[PDB]
């Protein structure tokens, strides 16, 4: 006689990481060659990179984002999700966030013409679809990237505010905002900032609800001609 | 000289049972400890329970649906299908139906807040995939379970109506509706209710074609925060 | 270890054709049965033909524009765009342009009463929406058709002028005027006519900005009665 037991559904993936420390490791190791051409490549083909990782079976995959090259923990393969990725890991998710943190810093530590190189080249699919483009503010724009949610202190609650903005107009499910609520704003953890800095997340939501900008590029005689 | 004979294909499994009486036996024996946590466990892992029974070779298997425990005639093993399971038997199929009858009664004999405990906990994979969730009506929702087809009087032709709804949009094969046509609506048998209560099955089909609802759950500070 | 590369966005479809020669081929092969009833049919249902081609998966589709029948390279299906269509090809786009060239010639080589048969029957959706109708000049009217842009010598820069007129009041994106800049005015290529014949495109823009006319048709006793 065989007896065999069955149970309840998951609680989704929680923070099984230190985000500020994982962003450190990324920043230290990877951003050494990394440039705006390589970064835009990651965002643009963000669609395809997510698919191609979910295609492949291997646990350690490299992305060749132009010449720049990153090692990514593939958690996107079916089999591979629910195998804990280290405290220092990169995933598609974390990596996207990490590039977005890298940039939100960049956008607030670099020259206004260097920032225009950022603003032309980097194209954010999630941001662009919901209107938002660079002009609306860098901090707003960058938080549409997934993985931004790990760190809410930098962006000042715009990842959560966006999260909240998608759910209340029925676009994203409540449950992915469980992962967000299990992240830090500064060094404060889940429950504390939840009410302490409620009014932050309110103003941040108010802001990101409206905003929109748009841009175009490419050819050279055509560019010039057309302008007049 | 050896002579040896060959023949035609089956007629599929027919009612080799009394369904109202098999549901009695279930109800009497099993629903004595059985609770909404145990029930949801059966539905949720309905996917895995079907697989795990089809894996195992043994003819009598027990399911440990939380603490609650049921003895199931395994007919799901390859070898084991086409060995008649008694008139009082439980199979995966019958059992699922039997839990769904148990509930359709429950949903119409229990308090509206107790019904909300049902409506949160029990998640029906077959119902959820084709949209349907509790709000659309209990009787509709429960008939997506297989084994519901044994008893058409309780649900009022929704098992057959669903059956019919899957076949006409090419999702299920005609032949599983041969088993359904060999079941009872009330105490009437196959042929009689087929035309007598044709207009029942029509209105029932009309109903179950549209319907959809959805729900989400889990965390506690996150729940509260998110709500506003 | 799998390594896999990602890159930058397209440059849009460029002239992968000879337009004057593709219009030749069209003119030779197709305009042999083609009549004003068939032509108007193409324009009128220009809306639906674009949709129906983008619906279908097949690479060679025929349009049955009344009795008249044309073979069109379907580049409008999702899958099918970015598969080069020959130097002699017809696409929805090219074809529309080609009918518009056919006509702009017709409108300047046919009798003024035959031109009135053209002017009643052919209805140009893109032209009509932005006011323009036949009276404003044939050359103006016909250039609203897409595919007109391939040949700028015939119309005398009205396709580009219109293009420019849509972009500067925010109606069309800059990038479709990259395709236009990669076409010929007479036999001159992109860069040369860009500045050489700048003042052509200026006067042409000045013209097409204002213009509007309108018409009505159908019934017979009603027509007559109403007139008085």
Author numbering:
A (entry chain B), B (entry chain A), C (entry chain C): 1 to 228
Please share excerpts from the published article on this structure:
Based on a cryo-EM average at 13 Å resolution and subsequent fitting of NP crystal structures by molecular dynamics, we were able to generate a pseudo-atomic model of the NP portion of the RNP. Given the absence of long, straight NP sections amenable to helical reconstruction, ~135,000 short NP sections were selected and processed using a single particle approach. Therefore, these numbers were applied for a final reconstruction with local searches, resulting in a 13 Å average that converged on a −105.26° twist and 18.25 Å rise. To preserve these aspects of the structure, we produced a model of what we termed ‘split’ NP that contained the core of a single NP monomer and the bound arms of its two neighbors. The NP structure was symmetrized, and molecular dynamics were applied to restrain the ‘split’ NP. This allowed freedom of movement of the linker region of each terminal arm, which had already been shown to be flexible while minimizing alterations to the globular core of the protein or the binding regions of the arms. A limitation of this approach was that it prevented us from modeling the viral RNA along the NP arms, and therefore, we did not include it in our model. Displaying the surface coulombic potential of the helical model confirms that the positively charged RNA-binding groove of each monomer is aligned in a way that maintains an RNA-binding channel along with the interior of the entire helical filament. Furthermore, these rungs were too far apart (approximately 18 Å) to permit intermolecular interactions of any kind between NP monomers along the longitudinal axis. Our model suggests that the helical arrangement of BUNV RNP is dictated by lateral NP-NP interactions and does not involve longitudinal NP-NP interactions, providing a molecular explanation of the RNP flexibility. However, by comparing these NP-NP contacts with those within the native helical NP, 7 novel residues were identified between laterally adjacent NP monomers with sidechains potentially involved in weak H-bond or salt bridge interactions within the RNP helix.
Bunyamwera virus (BUNV) is the prototypic orthobunyavirus that serves as a tractable model for the Bunyavirales order. Each segment is encapsidated by multiple copies of the nucleocapsid protein (NP) to form a ribonucleoprotein (RNP), which associates with the virus-encoded RNA-dependent RNA polymerase (RdRp; L). RNPs serve as the active templates for all viral RNA synthesis activities and represent the form in which the RNA segments are packaged into virions. The BUNV NP comprises a globular core with N- and C-terminal lobes bisected by a positively charged RNA-binding groove, accommodating approximately 11 RNA bases.
